[PDB]
């Protein structure tokens, strides 16, 4: 007891200060929420008015002695630009997909330190899980051929893509701007790995395994390159010649990304050629073919856009 | 231009104040993070010391003129109780599953208003998606029998359970205390819906469809009752006789929850009885049987514990 009584009295002294510090923290927690409320309401209100006057300018654009109108348009371009900056700091309401999963919790990371550190943890997840795909997909093609192991690799893909969607819809809400297609692509590929999962073994499977498992290897290996491309881009973006690195970086990368897009079409063509063969008699082939064709029409098109912008700017 | 010039000068006046308000908000944002840092470090430090002295008391418990030791133990029970209160307010590091999915973003909802409003949105998600399960599972059993529609219902289950895991690992981190088993149960049932997905049609399937689809209906209908039980509990918890409602509420509910547990074992027994039949010759049956047996051993056991605590307290 002698020690048991002694520790309490001094521990009580230190506990007292900790109790009072938390009392102040509760105050500045609530006062900051009110500051979050007013500031959020103020910007969204003024953004509405200027958009109306921007609409007014839009209707008054033919009203063109018009040099101010172009400059006020630049001024409107400036004002909308600044409001897009501040709102990145304030909490933003979740989108649609983040209301189904993860619920209505504010996932907005305030400081730029966090907005940076999260982007790298997103990359370090794409790489770390990619090599696990290569190892398993390499085994399924060369070492062991069975429906159970191909189901284990396919279930990993359905999880890898569905997880990457949540880790991207946060980045859109966090303040970054990923192209509209990439979020949609992560769905079609999931639905693609869905139909393949319920394929029944037969003659149709052993004619569409090598062309799918090998393609899963090459696309996975390309992901290694995009890492060394984007990781190099982000660190420099944190800090002219960088634009040369950006152009030269995409230059070495574009052939491989186009090679994959043409392979994607070639796997699509096989299925339609395999389906029209009478011996197939499986519903799953033709509904598996369209995602492959759909992915090619999107990827080859969207990749051309980001390059056209790169040459333009 | 006359209107185009006029709006800017007054809009500039209002924009000025909004610019300065955001300037102060940036200050109290950072000062609160430092307050979050110090307060979080202070409690976790003192929690360690008292745990050591609690360990010291643990080793000095046989040292028993011991009435203070019991009271200091109560004092230790009080101190640990208070620290569990404050830390619920401060941000807490993500667990393990929330590091794989959703990344390292603070999902801690500070005010008690949010900690309450999230719990109801979790229930309102369990109900809203349950009736969609009943409608589809009712169709798959009576209206239409096909491998494609049963795959559509099964994929919905794999998503419904995997989504409920994220919406629960947040509640554990948010401050609630869900039993350890319930988070694990949402995995085994997912793995159960996994093996059934790769079942190949044959003689074994049409002998294990009615006993699974109907069981999926009854378990889904029970979920309607748990809603009217928990929703009634939470609203009263927000505010003696309530304990009578709690005891009477579980009393009417316990028979149905036990009826389901015995059905779970009965479906498990069929598979082992079906597997030992030579005509099956499918790997998926016996690996599908153990989850059904595993779920019964857990559910019937854990449900008995929460009732034993209810009678005890």
Residue numbers in the entry:
A (entry chain A), B (entry chain B): 9 to 72, 76 to 250, 262 to 335
Task: Pull text from the paper.
TACAN is an α-helical TM protein that forms a symmetric dimer. Each protomer consists of six TM helices (S1–S6), which form a barrel surrounding a tunnel open to the cytoplasm. The TACAN protomer is related in three-dimensional structure to a fatty acid elongase, ELOVL7.
Alongside the functional characterization, we analyzed the structure of TACAN determined at 3.5 Å resolution using single-particle cryo-EM. The two protomers of the TACAN dimer bury an extensive surface area of 3049 Å2, mediated through the TM domain as well as two long N-terminal helices that form a coiled coil. Non-continuous density was observed inside the tunnel, suggesting the presence of a small, non-protein molecule. The TM domain in TACAN is indeed similar to ELOVL7. TACAN conserves two of the four histidine residues. In the purified TACANWT sample, the apo form is dominant and incubation with S-ethyl-CoA shifts it to one and two analogue bound forms. In addition, no enzymatic activity was observed for TACAN using a free-CoA detection assay (for details), which demonstrated robust activity for ELOVL7, thus TACAN does not appear to catalyze the same reaction as ELOVL7.
